Amino acid sequence: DVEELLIPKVWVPPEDPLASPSRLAKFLRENGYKVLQPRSLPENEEYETDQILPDLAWMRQIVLKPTLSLPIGDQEYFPKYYPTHRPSKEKPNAYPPDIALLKQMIYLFLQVPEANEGLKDEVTLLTQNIRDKAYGSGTYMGQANRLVAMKEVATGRNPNKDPLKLGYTFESIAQLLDITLPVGPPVPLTRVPSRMLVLTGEVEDYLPKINLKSSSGLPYVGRTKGETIGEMIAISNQFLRELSTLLKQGAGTKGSNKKKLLSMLSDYWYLSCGLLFPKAERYDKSTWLTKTRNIWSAPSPTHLMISMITWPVMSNSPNNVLNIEGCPSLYKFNPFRGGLNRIVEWILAPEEPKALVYADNIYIVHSNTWYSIDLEKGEANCTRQHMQAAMYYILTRGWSDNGDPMFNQTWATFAMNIAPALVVDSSCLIMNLQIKTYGQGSGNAATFINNHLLSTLVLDQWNLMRQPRPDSEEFKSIEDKLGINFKIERSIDDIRGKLRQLVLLAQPGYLSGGVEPEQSSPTVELDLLGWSATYSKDLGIYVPVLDKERLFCSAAYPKGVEVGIEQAYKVVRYEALRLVGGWNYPLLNKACKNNAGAARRHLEAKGFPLDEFLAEWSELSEFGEAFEGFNIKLTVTSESLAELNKPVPPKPPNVNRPVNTGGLKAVSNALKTGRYRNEAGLSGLVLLATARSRLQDAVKAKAEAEKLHKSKPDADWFERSETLSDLLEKADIASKVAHSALVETSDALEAV
Numbered sequence: 103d104v105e106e107l108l109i110p111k112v113w114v115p116p117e118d119p120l121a122s123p124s125r126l127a128k129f130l131r132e133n134g135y136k137v138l139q140p141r142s143l144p145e146n147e148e149y150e151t152d153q154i155l156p157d158l159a160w161m162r163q164i165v166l167k168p169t170l171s172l173p174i175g176d177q178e179y180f181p182k183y184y185p186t187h188r189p190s191k192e193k194p195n196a197y198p199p200d201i202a203l204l205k206q207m208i209y210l211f212l213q214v215p216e217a218n219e220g221l222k223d224e225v226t227l228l229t230q231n232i233r234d235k236a237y238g239s240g241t242y243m244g245q246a247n248r249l250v251a252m253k254e255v256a257t258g259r260n261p262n263k264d265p266l267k268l269g270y271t272f273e274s275i276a277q278l279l280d281i282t283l284p285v286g287p288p289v290p291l292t293r294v295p296s297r298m299l300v301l302t303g304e305v306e307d308y309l310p311k312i313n314l315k316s317s318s319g320l321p322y323v324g325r326t327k328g329e330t331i332g333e334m335i336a337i338s339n340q341f342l343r344e345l346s347t348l349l350k351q352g353a354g355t356k357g358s359n360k361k362k363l364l365s366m367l368s369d370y371w372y373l374s375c376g377l378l379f380p381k382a383e384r385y386d387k388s389t390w391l392t393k394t395r396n397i398w399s400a401p402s403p404t405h406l407m408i409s410m411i412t413w414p415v416m417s418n419s420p421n422n423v424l425n426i427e428g429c430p431s432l433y434k435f436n437p438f439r440g441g442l443n444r445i446v447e448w449i450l451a452p453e454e455p456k457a458l459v460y461a462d463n464i465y466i467v468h469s470n471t472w473y474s475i476d477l478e479k480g481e482a483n484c485t486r487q488h489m490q491a492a493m494y495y496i497l498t499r500g501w502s503d504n505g506d507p508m509f510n511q512t513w514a515t516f517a518m519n520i521a522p523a524l525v526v527d528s529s530c531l532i533m534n535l536q537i538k539t540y541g542q543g544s545g546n547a548a549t550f551i552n553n554h555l556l557s558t559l560v561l562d563q564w565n566l567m568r569q570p571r572p573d574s575e576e577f578k579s580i581e582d583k584l585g586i587n588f589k590i591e592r593s594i595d596d597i598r599g600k601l602r603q604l605v606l607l608a609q610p611g612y613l614s615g616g617v618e619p620e621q622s623s624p625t626v627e628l629d630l631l632g633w634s635a636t637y638s639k640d641l642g643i644y645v646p647v648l649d650k651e652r653l654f655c656s657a658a659y660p661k662g663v664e665v666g667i668e669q670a671y672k673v674v675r676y677e678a679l680r681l682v683g684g685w686n687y688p689l690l691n692k693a694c695k696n697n698a699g700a701a702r703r704h705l706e707a708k709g710f711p712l713d714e715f716l717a718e719w720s721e722l723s724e725f726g727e728a729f730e731g732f733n734i735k736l737t738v739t740s741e742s743l744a745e746l747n748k749p750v751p752p753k754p755p756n757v758n759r760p761v762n763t764g765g766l767k768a769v770s771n772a773l774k775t776g777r778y779r780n781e782a783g784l785s786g787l788v789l790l791a792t793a794r795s796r797l798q799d800a801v802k803a804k805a806e807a808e809k810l811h812k813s814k815p816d817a818d819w820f821e822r823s824e825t826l827s828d829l830l831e832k833a834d835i836a837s838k839v840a841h842s843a844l845v846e847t848s849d850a851l852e853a854v
Contacts, residue, residue, distance in 0.1 A: 108208075109201055110233055115390055117191050118241040123533045126246060133250045136538040138529055141371045141854040143321055145175030154336050157296055161305070170332045173321040173372075183323055183377045183531045188238045199232040200660050203676075206693040220621065224689040231658035236387050239380035240394030245532065247392045249378075249540075252482035255587050256540040263585030264487045265559060272494040272790065273782055273819050274773055275555065279495045280781070281766045282430055282459055282558040283551070284421040286756035288414035291501050291509035295338045295406055310413035312405065317379065319401040320372040320531070327402050334402040341370060341403060345520075346512040353798045353835075363798060367850035373404045374528040374851045375536065376543045384659050398481075398543025404524050408547040411493065411517055415500030416551070423448065423458060424752040428765035430561070432460035433554075436728065437633045437646035440749030446635050446644040450598055455569040457561055457766070460631060461553035464560060464588075466572050472597040473572040474629050477560075478587035480553035484542035486522035486844055492551045493517040494789050498782040499758055505783020505816075511792065511800045518793045519843040521548075523851060556586055565770035592629060600626050604637040604644070612685050613747070614639035616740035619688045625650070636686060638747065640740070645747045648683030648725075657690065661724050666710050671722070672701040673712070673736070678723045680738040681746075695738075780816035787811055787826055794827065797843040799835035806833055 120126050130137055148169045152159045155170075162168065189196035207225050214221060256262050265275065279285075289298070289308050298308040314328030322330050344366055351359050376398035385393060400408075422431040424444055435441060448456075449467060458465040462480030466473040477483060497517060501508045509517075526542045542552055563580045570576035572590060581587055594600065604624060611619035614637075625634040625647055633646040660675055676698040684690045705712050719736050720726035734746060755761065759781075762769075772778060780786050787810060791803035806829045816822050830836035837843060 109204070110199070112194060112198075113236060113387065114194050115190055115236070115238075115241075118187065118243055119391070120241070120243040120246055123535060126242060126533055127535060129243075129246055130249075130535075130537060133253070135250060135253055138536045138538065138852055139854050140180055140536045141368075141852075142178040142180050143372055144173045145177050145179055146171045146173055146321065147175045149174070151332060155296055155332065155339075158299060158335075160301055161299070166332050170336055171322070171330075172333065172336065180534060181320060181323055181372075181531060182534045184533060185239070185378070185380050187241055187380060188382075189236070197237040197659060197662060199658055201232075202697060203657060203693055204228055204232065206697055207689045210689055210692055210696075221689055224687060227654045228658055228690075231384075231654050234386055234388075235384045235655065235659060236390065237382065237384050237659035237661065239382045240385055241380075241391055242532075243391045244385075244389070244394030245378060245380055245396055248394055248396055249537075252479055253538075253540045255479055255482040260581055260585055260587055262483055262485050262541065264485050265491065265584070266487050268584070269776075270491075270559070271819070271823070272491055272793070273780060273786060274778065275491045275559075276495045276498060277769055277773065277778065277781060278558050278562050278766070279555065280499070280759065280762050281428070281764075281769055282561065283419075283433060283495075283554055284426060284429060284431070284755070284757050284759075284762075285415055285419045285496065285500045286421070287500060287503070287508075287758045288418065291411065291497075291513040294342050295335045295410065298410075308414070310406065310409040311417075312402070312409070317377060317399045319377055319399045319405070320375055321401070323377065323531075330402055334406055337403040338406050341373070341407070342512060342516070345515065346510070348798060349512060349515060349800050351798070352801060353796065359798060363846075364850045364853065367847055368853040371851050371854070373401050374524040376400055376528075376530045376539065376545060378530045378532040379545070381544075382661070384655050396544055398530055398539060398545040400525065400543070400546050404521075405547050407516065408521050408525065411496055411501075411513070411521075412547055412551065415496055418756055419500075420753055421755045421757060425755045426757075426761060427763040430457050430459045430766060432458050432463075432465075432631060435460070435631060437630070438728070438732075438746050440643065440747070442630070442633060442635060442646040443643040443749070444752075445630060446601055450601060457564070459554065459557050459561065461550050462557060463631070464557050465628075465630065467597060468569070468571050470595070470597055470599075471571075472594040472628060473590055474592045475572060475588055476591050477553065477556055478589055479541075480556055481544050481549065482541040483556055483586045484526055484552050486526045486848070488555055489522040489526050489542065489548055489552050490518050490793065490844065492548055492555050493521060494782075494786075494793075495555075496551070497789060498785050502758070502783065502785045505785060507785035507788055509785075511788075511804050514789060514792045514804075515797060515800045515843075518789055519797055520847055523844055523848040526552075527848070528851065559584055560586060560588065561766060562770050562773075565767050566774060569767075592627075594626065594628070597626075601635065601644075604635060608637040608639050612738075612740050612743050613641065613645060616640060619686065619691060622687050625686070634683070640744060641747055641749075643747070643749065645743075646683075647686045650683075650687075653679070653683050653687070653690075656724065657684075657694075666705070666708060667715070669701040669705050670710065670712060670715050673698050673705075674716070674719055674722050676701070677736040677738055678719075678725045681736065682725045682728070685738060685743060776820060778819050780819040780822050783816060784808070784811045787816070787822065790823065790826060791830060793843070794837065795830055795835040795843070796837045797846060802833060802835045803830065806830060806835070 149172050151168050151170050300306045312327050318325040318327050318330040379397040379399045381395035381397050420434045455468040462477040464475040525546045530539045607624050608614050609621050609623040610617050625636045627634050629649050635644045636647050638645045676694040680694045684694050720729050787807040788804050791807040795803040
């Protein structure tokens with residue numbers, strides 16, 4: 103019959119049946135997936151840097167190239183993006199399973215003098231992952247197939263819903279976000295990116311962070327952000343200077359300057375088209391053709407501009423469940439330094455129902471059960487109005503002093519009427535094809551906040567129907583109400599009981615008795631942002647362990663480097679596996695330790711500078727994000743696990759508003775009455791007017807909002823909204839229904 107092996111044969115991936123533009127187009131049209139009429143792009147051409155960025159000429163002589171490549175050519179082209187899929191039928195050895203690890207674990211199991219099926223399970227589990235899975239970037243057929251599935255989440259079973267058509271308003275959503283994502287203040291949003299680098303006659307840097315290794319996007323396919331820094335800033339400068347000019351000229355009287363705007367947006371279409379990057383991961387072999395995650399790689403200028411709004415506000419908002427009463431947020435949670443122990447105490451407390459949120463994740467305890475819930479592809483559910491609501495939130499509570507806008511009408515117009523259209527329901531480039539993106543793109547700079555807002559809406563609706571149990575028809579009905587798909591990934595009955603038993607049943611190991619473990623210590627697999635709980639007798643608290651399935655999945659298929667440094671990367675690999683949770687699993691632990699030891703001894707004898715290589719190991723590791731800015735060595739001992747886990751007081755919260763401690767229930771109940779305050783103030787009205795008026799009438803929209811605010815003493819919001827609606831129509835600057843400024847700029851982006 104059939105041949106069985108201890109060590110799997112090298113897998114040969116199947117042939118990609120869509121590796122051609124003719125076949126891809128055929129498949130998309132077949133499934134009624136929209137293909138756009140292709141727009142072209144001016145060829146990139148060399149230009150002297152000191153002529154485009156004169157106010158940054160000082161940083162060249164005391165940096166970046168002297169010439170910039172700009173999309174300004176006479177001859178045009180249609181852009182092409184052809185990602186390289188690894189591994190493949192032709193080239194199958196890109197990402198081998200860790201056979202050395204498997205052999206070591208088998209070797210050590212054989213040395214143990216008897217029995218022990220509990221040790222053998224480690225071998226069984228690693229072997230099962232090596233067989234079932236493969237690491238790499240899948241296939242075109244998989245990418246395409248994934249695309250068809252989001253067109254389904256967005257337009258099929260439960261089509262996306264504009265939340266404003268459901269009764270929500272910008273302000274009502276913001277007040278939910280006051281609870282679920284509290285934000286503090288960051289220089290005002292009034293400058294082009296060039297003026298975000300100041301010289302004191304030292305230099306001050308106010309520009310967001312971006313990884314120099316990621317792809318630049320349009321118009322620089324095949325180039326990194328690191329190779330296009332000057333260009334990225336140049337294009338953002340140009341774009342914003344043009345927009346402010348347009349807003350300064352206004353509506354030409356009578357609608358003349360309406361062909362300036364369409365001209366500009368059409369010329370900047372490429373700012374709304376992401377590269378469809380195949381996301382590398384541990385996929386199931388059986389679904390190599392039907393499942394490949396995609397990353398929508400934003401054009402680098404679109405990314406710079408959007409994150410100039412989001413980053414400074416979010417990068418100094420460490421506000422969550424740990425440091426604000428009633429806050430459900432897990433934003434910037436870290437399980438080390440007593441982190442996890444504190445969440446477990448939160449679970450253990452008798453209060454229920456209660457909720458936690460992080461982007462597209464909702465954790466609920468109800469009737470002594472723990473429920474982990476995911477939004478079914480968050481991004482795909484997102485509409486433009488969801489994102490403009492996120493923008494409205496960030497500006498009114500991040501970019502405002504008391505209610506006074508700390509932003510231009512230029513930046514206001516970009517935020518409310520351009521950025522959602524660039525990045526939600528726009529387009530993407532795969533092979534040579536320009537095709538629709540349904541929902542928000544997986545890669546963009548507002549992903550976290552847009553998803554977080556989506557989950558916030560789910561929670562609001564959960565509160566509104568008296569907090570039903572998550573596995574009930576009642577809870578399920580929320581998806582119809584909101585057009586937001588979700589599922590239960592996992593639930594755990596008798597959650598408190600199980601968490602309490604961890605204390606009773608903890609086994610000797612590095613964190614209980616300070617010894618090398620003979621036996622695995624029990625856990626509760628919470629999947630709390632990927633973390634489990636276990637009990638440390640040495641510290642007397644709960645400590646994190648990586649979720650067991652994730653851990654063995656990672657062990658099975660290491661990520662690539664993608665002379666001498668190969669042994670050094672193995673030290674990182676194996677020690678980090680231990681550090682994140684391998685320490686709690688006996689065979690995994692020792693095998694990783696032995697293999698790391700052999701790589702270390704090989705390097706010491708060759709005089710390799712290991713200490714220097716590992717100085718910033720966090721960047722070299724798939725787990726590093728959890729260890730960022732802790733300045734800890736890679737060693738894994740009793741002392742290091744203890745030091746990593748030693749409780750540290752949570753840093754104080756940073757809120758730009760008086761701290762709201764009522765909890766989400768109260769704000770939900772107050773809000774269903776349709777009567778609430780304008781907690782946003784003037785900038786709230788400014789942004790309303792900006793959203794509700796034609797794009798080129800933005801300056802007038804603000805002035806009209808300033809007159810209404812001057813009109814008193816804001817109190818009731820709904821009244822305030824309706825009076826401002828009358829003022830906009832009387833000046834004839836308000837746009838017609840179903841022809842909002844947002845819709846206009848979207849249409850002009852797929853003009854051509």
